[PDB]
Ligand SMILES: NC(=O)C[C@H](NC(=O)c1c[nH]c(/C=C/C(=O)N2CCOCC2)c1-c1ccc(Cl)cc1F)c1ccc(F)c(Cl)c1
Ligand code: NA
């Protein structure tokens with residue numbers, strides 16, 4: 124079940140502008156991006172703001188803290204730069220930026236690189252220098268997914284970009300997964316064995332189709348930290364990125380668990396390091412978002 128535990132809004136603002144959320148490496152603290160480009164740190168139970176930082180001059184779309192607490196990735200909507208890497212030790216400061224990349228992630232095993240997406244193109248950067256190490260794009264193998272989002276696998280040796288599997292060491296495309304939808308490019312299962320591209324579940328070893336999961340159509344997904352539950356929410360067609368519902372699935376067998384309709388459009392969700400709480404950004408209206416905390 125998801126029992127509403129608490130709710131809060133952007134403190135002392137006429138219109139609350141939360142757009143995205145992530146739990147910090149520090150417990151009891153949620154990081155929220157806003158539609159005016161700020162990063163807020165909230166005490167999650169009190170619902171009280173503790174700190175605010177200026178990141179972008181447009182809406183923050185997504186953010187990701189490093190596991191070590193030292194770094195933060197942000198992306199924005201119509202700023203230059205579109206994505207940035209922030210240091211959080213001693214002083215909050217921009218370390219590097221990624222000009223035209225509208226989406227960024229850390230590498231997974233060792234968080235020493237950033238992978239950025241610009242349209243059909245993936246860019247891999249070194250965190251130390253900020254240098255672009257690799258550009259990944261193969262015109263023979265592209266799927267041209269409209270909502271492409273490049274990502275590393277659990278051990279960082281592979282990348283999925285535009286439904287193409289790349290060997291990072293050799294910078295070679297090793298397999299193109301066949302195209303079944305216009306938008307969604309896929310993610311790696313945390314098990315290291317499977318690729319989830321929209322409704323299709325592929326075996327990483329054989330490239331065989333393992334399963335079809337229709338309810339995942341047009342969804343962004345995130346796994347809990349233990350890798351036992353998958354959350355999906357359907358994008359709306361191209362403003363809130365999602366509709367009013369999310370779904371959970373058992374990550375071991377892809378069986379559905381629950382469908383949760385919150386009757387309001389969803390901007391983001393995240394679970395804490397311990398998988399005890401779910402935070403969801405929901406539009407009350409008019410942009411006037413709240414962050415709801417749910418007990419899992
Ligand atoms: N933190 C995470 O990774 C969780 C992830 N959030 C997002 O994916 C996300 C969360 N937000 C966005 C954009 C927002 C956006 O473009 N905006 C909002 C602000 O105004 C400008 C437009 C995205 C997003 C949209 C499209 C694309 Cl291809 C990439 C994305 F990252 C998630 C996973 C499962 C879910 F059930 C839910 Cl509800 C959310
Ligand atoms: Na305190």
Ligand code: NA
Pocket residue numbers: 374375376
């Ligand atoms: Na499985």
